Paper text:
In this work, we selected CYP105A1 from Streptomyces griseolus to study the biochemical and structural mechanisms of inhibition. CYP105A1 can catalyze 2-step (25- and 1α-) hydroxylation reactions of vitamin D3 (VD3) to produce hormonally active 1α,25-dihydroxyvitamin D3 (1α,25(OH)2D3). The structures show that the ligand binding pocket is predominantly surrounded by hydrophobic residues, although there are three arginine residues (Arg73, Arg84, and Arg193) in the binding pocket. Our previous studies showed that wild-type and mutant CYP105A1 metabolize 12 types of non-steroidal anti-inflammatory drugs (NSAIDs), including diclofenac, with the R84A mutant exhibiting particularly high activity towards many NSAIDs.
Numbering used by the authors: 7 to 408
The structure:
Amino acid sequence: TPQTTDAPAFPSNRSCPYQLPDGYAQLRDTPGPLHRVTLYDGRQAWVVTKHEAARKLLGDPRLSSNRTDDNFPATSPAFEAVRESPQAFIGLDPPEHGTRRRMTISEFTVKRIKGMRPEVEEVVHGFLDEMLAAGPTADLVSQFALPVPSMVICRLLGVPYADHEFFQDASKRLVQSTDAQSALTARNDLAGYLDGLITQFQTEPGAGLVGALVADQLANGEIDREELISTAMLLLIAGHETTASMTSLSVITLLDHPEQYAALRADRSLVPGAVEELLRYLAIADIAGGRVATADIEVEGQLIRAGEGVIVVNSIANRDGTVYEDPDALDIHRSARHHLAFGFGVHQCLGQNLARLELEVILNALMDRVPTLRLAVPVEQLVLRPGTTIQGVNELPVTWHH
Ligand code: HEM
Ligand SMILES: CC(=O)N1CCN(c2ccc(OC[C@H]3CO[C@](Cn4ccnc4)(c4ccc(Cl)cc4Cl)O3)cc2)CC1
């Protein structure tokens, strides 16, 4: 008897870095803002698959971000690590979301990001210096894509880059965790490290966001010590793991579209617009779209009930053809405005403009310093991370004219 279902398994895994999984193309192609899916443990949930309905639902305070709710949609057993408190503000609703978020925004302003450009350029060209001096073949991930945003986010936070071996290993173990025990261990490892850093700042006040939170909000009782740990850990992992994935997938994608990459090198004024298109097209943080309804929500004749899980799948929303004509075509010249790679609304990515800065500087540096850059293995041989985490590749063999 047939196996066809009306609530297919979710998430799906990419088989090409810049292509929707087959099941997601199916969801994109079916009319209506929502579709039922089956999560890993058999629970049904809703996915949002259309662009404006995704903006609307991201804007709806009845869809809560509280990951500790028992009805929050967990997409893998590893969710239990981040299901355990205290949540950073990414998992808070108004008004608590605002009080905590505002403790960090000063580090991510347009003015501050502008002020970081000389640092980002120096760090990028330093790791390129070292990689190009050693000659090919190199893994772009370990040699460049990951160290660059790690060094930058360390100075922003006041986390000593000398500890990068420890905290990068713990972050990777957390990001890649496929069961709760592995994820909790990695999280506990980072948590204890950050607790010791807090104690060091209480002895010796210091620079960086962590040092600022310790000396002010923590000392006034306005943030819990373990809330500070959760917030710093969010920013540290988002600050280097997510951006690193965006670099490697962008390089793969541009090399698979040689005409567009050549147009980009020939006119660097196109880089900001290319960055927006790559963000729309690669949408690497599908995993960040989970919500839980605290009240019934009517959506174009379909009803979300209080207690149901909803996942706003921004990658599928970003392929909405009513917003992006020929949505599966990479076009660095198109209008990629209003894309949802960073979300929308009160939770829109705090790091978005640092990510935009870093990708711009990195793309120009690679075109400047390594114009002969090419992959050292076929694209099909690369290993893509599954849909249960941030999209990316575990390694990226590259070569170039030595
Ligand atoms: C290409 C890189 C990145 C992408 C695609 C991305 C994606 C996202 C998305 C989709 C959200 C919305 C989550 C939701 O609605 O629940 C978000 C939130 C957030 N991101 Fe990013 N992110 C990136 C880089 C960064 C960086 C570099 C940081 C630096 C610390 C960062 C920090 C945050 C924070 C703190 C939030 C929570 C915002 C809030 O709850 O008010 N992200 N991100
Ligand atoms: C639920 C599940 O399957 N898993 C496995 C993947 N996990 C994971 C993945 C990435 C990660 O990096 C930093 C976290 C911080 O926020 C996200 C998304 N993000 C990244 C940058 N800006 C936002 C995120 C990621 C996962 C989930 Cl469920 C929700 C969210 Cl907002 O990454 C930290 C943990 C742990 C939970």
